Amino acid sequence: AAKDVKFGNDARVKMLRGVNVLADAVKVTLGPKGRNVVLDKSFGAPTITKAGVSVAREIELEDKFENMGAQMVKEVASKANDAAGDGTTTATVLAQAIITEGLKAVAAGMNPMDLKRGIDKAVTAAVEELKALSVPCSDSKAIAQVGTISANSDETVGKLIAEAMDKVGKEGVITVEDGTGLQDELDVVEGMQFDRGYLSPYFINKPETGAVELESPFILLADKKISNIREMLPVLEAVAKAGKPLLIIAEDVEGEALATLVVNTMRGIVKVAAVKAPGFGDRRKAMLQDIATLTGGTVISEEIGMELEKATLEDLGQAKRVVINKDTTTIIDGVGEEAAIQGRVAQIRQQIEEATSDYDREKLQERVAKLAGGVAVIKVGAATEVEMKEKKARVEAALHATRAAVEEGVVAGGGVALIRVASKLADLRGQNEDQNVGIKVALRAMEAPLRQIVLNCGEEPSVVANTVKGGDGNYGYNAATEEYGNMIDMGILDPTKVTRSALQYAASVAGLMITTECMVTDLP
Amino acid sequence: AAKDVKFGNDARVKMLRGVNVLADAVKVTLGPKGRNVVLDKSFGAPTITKAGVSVAREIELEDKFENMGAQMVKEVASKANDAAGDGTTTATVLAQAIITEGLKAVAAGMNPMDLKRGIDKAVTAAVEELKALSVPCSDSKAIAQVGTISANSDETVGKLIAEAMDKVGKEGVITVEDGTGLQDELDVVEGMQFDRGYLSPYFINKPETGAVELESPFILLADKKISNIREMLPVLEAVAKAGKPLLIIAEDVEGEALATLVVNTMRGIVKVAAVKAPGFGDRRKAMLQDIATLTGGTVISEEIGMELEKATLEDLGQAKRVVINKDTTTIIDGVGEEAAIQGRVAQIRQQIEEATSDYDREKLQERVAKLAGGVAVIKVGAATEVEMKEKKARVEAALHATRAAVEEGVVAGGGVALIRVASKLADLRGQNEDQNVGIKVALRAMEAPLRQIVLNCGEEPSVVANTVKGGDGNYGYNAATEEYGNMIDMGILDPTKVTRSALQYAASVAGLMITTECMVTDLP
Amino acid sequence: AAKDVKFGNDARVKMLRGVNVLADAVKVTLGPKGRNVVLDKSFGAPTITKAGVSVAREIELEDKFENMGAQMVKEVASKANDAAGDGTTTATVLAQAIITEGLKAVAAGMNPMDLKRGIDKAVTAAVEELKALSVPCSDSKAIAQVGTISANSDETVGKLIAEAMDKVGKEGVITVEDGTGLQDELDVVEGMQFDRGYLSPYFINKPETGAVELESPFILLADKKISNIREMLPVLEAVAKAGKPLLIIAEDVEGEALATLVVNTMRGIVKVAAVKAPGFGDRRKAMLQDIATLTGGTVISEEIGMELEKATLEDLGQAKRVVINKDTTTIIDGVGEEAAIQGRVAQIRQQIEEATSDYDREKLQERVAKLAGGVAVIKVGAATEVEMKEKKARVEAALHATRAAVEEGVVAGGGVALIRVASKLADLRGQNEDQNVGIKVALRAMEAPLRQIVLNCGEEPSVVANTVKGGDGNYGYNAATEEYGNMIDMGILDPTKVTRSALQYAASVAGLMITTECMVTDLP
Ligand SMILES: Nc1ncnc2c1ncn2[C@@H]1O[C@H](COP(=O)(O)OP(=O)(O)OP(=O)(O)O)[C@@H](O)[C@H]1O
Ligand SMILES: Nc1ncnc2c1ncn2[C@@H]1O[C@H](COP(=O)(O)OP(=O)(O)OP(=O)(O)O)[C@@H](O)[C@H]1O
Ligand SMILES: Nc1ncnc2c1ncn2[C@@H]1O[C@H](COP(=O)(O)OP(=O)(O)OP(=O)(O)O)[C@@H](O)[C@H]1O
Ligand SMILES: [K+]
Ligand SMILES: [K+]
Ligand SMILES: [K+]
Ligand SMILES: [Mg+2]
Ligand SMILES: [Mg+2]
Ligand SMILES: [Mg+2]
16 A cells, blocks of 8 residues: 655654553553553453553554554553563553653754663663562562552452462462352362363262272273273282272273273272373373372383283382362372472473473473472452453462562562662763763653652652652652551562563663654555 | 556656655665664554665555656665665665766756666776775674674674674574574574484483483484384394494384384383484475485485385494484484585585575575584574564674675775775766766765765765765774774775675666656556 | 447547557657656556557557557557567557548548558558568678667677577577576577476486486487386396496386386486477477487387387487486487488478468477577576566567568668658559548658657757758668768668568558548447
8 A cells, every 4th residue: 555654753743642642541550549441342341451451452543653653562561461460551651751751862863773772771780780679579478468469459369379379389380260259269279180080970989979989099000092801801800809999090991891890890899990091192191100100100001012911010009098070080198209209399390491481381380289289279259240350360460470579579669669770870871972861761761650650649749759769778658558668568569570571671662662763654 | 447648857757756755765774873764564563674675665655656666766675685685775875866866967958878878887887896895804803893783883793693603604504583582592503403303202311301312323214104113124133233223214103113112222222213204295305315415324215116124224324423302303423424415515505596586495594504514593682572573684684794795895884985986987988978977977876875874963964975085995984983084993894795786786777767758657 | 338429520639649649658769869668567566668569558548539549559569569579669650650641631531541542552562662672681790780779779689699690590599588697698508409307306417406417328219108117128138238328208107117217227227317208299209200310219109010129229319418407308419410300301391381381380490490500598687677677678679670680681770761662652653632642641651760760869850851861872860870871881770571560560550540430439
């Protein structure tokens, strides 16, 4: 299509206009006294949210140039969210400050590229300063605090994530779903448990419900399917010579073998249950090995010379109790020694260097949690669907925030961190005057979060800013109680990772964005 | 469709106007104090770039005639990019100048054709003068400098390309992709390395991680599948008489074969590994020939008289050491003679210089880089996707600029080269006055790059130009430090190839373009 | 659709207007001081050309009637190009002159049909007169000159096609393609070359690229395909006793025989190559006989009593050198005596004197050209694609022009020839006054070319016309050097064929066009 082209001040003003539309559209959700946004959707009912990224994503402008600007600044929120999962609004505001002040510096006639350079320098130094200021977050109290703040000061979330991480372990895997009831409910699975229930409902035990429990059970593992039942002679007879109940694991077992199983179990000669393999292809075997080590038995595999026939009482695994229900399989206690299990945890460390980032991390934490650890599922309660969506979003985000807080530590919230590191980099300089101006632009922009929060609280931002800048250390302004004090002692802490990320991303996009001298877009 | 037609000055003015829209759209991106351009995209987010070609490709006008002009001059930047990969803007500016003064001369009533002739002669002579002026750049310092300048004065890129070219070789193959982290990372793989790791991790060697190393290994390769292993009697038994370890390569190997193999390695009679085929269909074979020749053995194929049974140790390949892990396989040094690998690099150089033009180059260069000349892969680091695209693009262009610099040498940047060869061609004449005017058009137009740079720096161009012409040799104006001096000592070098290419292309298209007397297009 | 109809002076004026649009659009490209035209293209970048036909083809008008006229006059340029390949503008201008002067005569109230009659007669006499004035063009100099003039006075092209025809032969085949490099490059293939490359790329020789050359090669030729390979005992045995390499030509060769063949070449016991039959049905056999005659061997044929098995070294052919590549097969020197070729060429001469006169003439002449008359491929060098297109086009046209010059001879350029034959037909009369007006219309129109060229040079056309008519013989006006003189001695030569063609076509189409009294077209 024929293109519309614009140059210089015209284009820059246009862009800035679009950017500011997006920014103003996002900013209303910042701070403890922030406000929500409703997004219409072509299909169903609209969405209410406080999460900046969503509103940014929904934003699109009619004026092609304004559209361009907004569509470029959206990447701030998007990348921020994709990276850490919180503080996206902060990032956006930073971006706006850098872009505005930057363009102002360009209007003085200064070299844009050098401005970008200065900004980049300042931001790098700031990142190092943050990495230094970062304080480790280990106690359940602090974690509760981060979770609370990331959920917009809702301590329910704090205590919830607290109980979760406390029970599973500080690194263990936690997931969250839409709840059934109105109140938040936490489900926790301890020890070895996985999907796929029993095959034949014909099996029953001492309790009801169809779930089968076994006393001092024996475990077998196989790679292939089975069809013959006479072929199970060397094993079954042995078990028939022991009297002890048996458990079998493979991808499947056909109707006739299961029939034999049901008949022999019903006549009461031996109690046996059968359950399909957990995963697919390589993964199911990779898990079968660890299950074997946990039980104490040895894996049998058709892909190796060892056949289904050759089966010994040492190849069989051992446990104290096993329970299998309709959908899930559960092992209570494997006789595998603590040294063996610990060694398994050792060998697991090798499996980390194959990311495949969060997919490898999720599968790895999944298989690891089936050891001494555990799995936590948070079911978020709400009255109506909108409440459900927003609440779940906030809870997820809170989880990500606590995770990042554990990973890279925390710094004093209320955006006082940026003020502190700027005030520390006050003496930072560049290779020439314009670059110095760039440095000053970045630093000046670093005050933006706090003052924006204060603006959203209906209080004079310049004043609060200056009064906070006048202080030292973790001195900051608590917006909820409208009083100054030590932010950490008041429990307002932002994960270092999210702040660092915000600053970096915003600095990148804005730094490039202020280097525009020409724009080409489609003609209307 | 019914056509609109225009003659003479009307058409020419229209054309010039279109050309000038494109030209101005490109021109803003020239020089160290140059500025960037934003291109809207029909699909996703907009693009920031400094690449003249990109903006040129994106340009299209509403007035059919202006459009004709612009769409004709875009080919300059395009052909320039396809040829050298840098200096496209320079070519564009040259074209604009030539077109303007040319059209002025035509409006003076001079014969356009003779103008073309004069321009062409002047340009040829200029090219000869440049190839004469060309100064070779072999050393790491200078290469670092040209790579640096092509990357808009970013010495990170220069030093990076330097380390690359140093490790792989000045002619060896280098590739570059978008990185994962924020900082640039360089990986270099020496010898033979490619995808597809082992299938069964059950067999292992001295190291951990599952990776297996072999001592003076023997290599096998097959085109089709297999099922029997007893049919491999004549080879395996022979190896059992040799003791040397074996490797197998095919599309895959079946379960029972894997069983026999794993058992045989576990019992410790012979250590052997098997890996799936690298490519697909013809490609995997085309590479299999190369691996066979590198090892020294001969390819076995079912489509030829040689069967799966018939296998000897002369067709079988040999190497000194091989390491294979989960996903990739690596051979360091094949015992295949240097004559074999050399003959093969010859043959591959032959097979690339035929296939055309774009689709083939990636797979073919992939096949080329896998020999004794290692392959270096540069991972470009960036904060956000936009920065990634622009930085990566600039890096590729810079790589091309350095390669072209190696191929044809360098001359003093700042476009002073053109000024100098112009000052040298002062006594050049033609067969008549009009051709002299053409020559003069070329010569005067050759000042355009430098003066344009100075103009972009916000300095008076005529003055700087005259002060540079007043000097001699590599005397030029460094715009970054805003000071005159020896361009070479300042590290401002333009590859001769890019300069020559620019001038020639611009000369062709403009030379033709100024001979227009009629234009025909569709009706609006 | 409902029709718009127009009569008499209205219609004629409309028609004339359209005609003049096309005419004015074309005339600008006439002469050495001619100018170019730009044609927009729906897909990619526009085309620059001097070729009248292209411009004529692109023209189309909105007014249905004007459109009608132009669309009728396009046929002149089209047929002219299909016939000779040059002089199309000349034809067009003649057409315009005839149409205008004619329409004036019709508006005088004279009988249009009689005008047609007169024009036709005058033109007939003129063509005969041209046949008389026609001077043979045999020497390399004259040919070069014609090539130069047809290439818009560029002696590079003249000398190039001259060298082409000189190396290849006055009867041999010459082709032209887009070059790879920047300079014009001539490739010449000596001795028999045709389609169909190798079958299996598996076999290779001393050179690379996959193309195989043979040393003092031996050739066999067959009519049918094969499936068995052992039955070729009498052949293979011979080569197995001789060691000399073999070449085979047949309809095809199946998979297993080709497999044995390639394996046979790989083990290195016998060097052999295989290539598909040249033509189809009658042509493949008819030429296979010729290959047999040139090599010295005898054709083997299944359709004749001699079997594939019974084959002796007397039936088998021999050659000096053979090179066969991916698509083409080439034999350098057949051992067949010089006398042998002549007799076959004789029989072909007998096959020429038959009915079917077109397609057969082409097949027969190619087949005749397949002997000592070498093949030339001209690779046209240029910097960019537009230059490439225009230059290649001009080169083809020049080639056709020289071919025609050789075929039917040459006459003095500058359009002085037409003036001469007009002045000769001054005393020509018809059957009535209106027809006299017709012949006079033709004659007056015949001055148009010269007058138009001078008009394009910007000098008074009437004066130069009169000064040239005032002279005698080949005295004419050279526009390039702006001086009068003997045109033949000045190297301005026009093929008689192209001029004759121009006059004839224009006379036909215009002659018909001026007899219009009604026009019927669609309603807008
Ligand atoms: N009670 C409080 N007093 C002072 N500052 C607070 C308080 N609660 C939160 N903040 C500050 O507000 C910021 C969080 O704002 P908000 O939760 O509205 O958006 P965000 O988390 O920055 O981004 P996202 O849109 O991803 O949620 C934090 O940086 C925090 O320091
Ligand atoms: N610091 C400097 N001082 C003087 N001249 C410079 C400096 N940096 C670059 N140049 C000149 O600028 C030119 C390169 O400009 P730039 O990299 O902006 O675009 P380009 O490479 O010409 O075109 P493109 O990159 O779009 O293909 C070089 O010819 C070089 O001589
Ligand atoms: N230097 C010259 N002096 C005089 N007449 C010339 C000269 N050059 C060419 N001509 C005349 O111009 C005619 C050819 O013109 P031109 O090559 O411009 O177009 P064309 O061949 O008529 O048609 P086309 O556009 O198809 O090439 C020839 O008949 C020749 O006599
Ligand atoms: K928020
Ligand atoms: K550039
Ligand atoms: K022409
Ligand atoms: Mg939040
Ligand atoms: Mg550059
Ligand atoms: Mg011509």
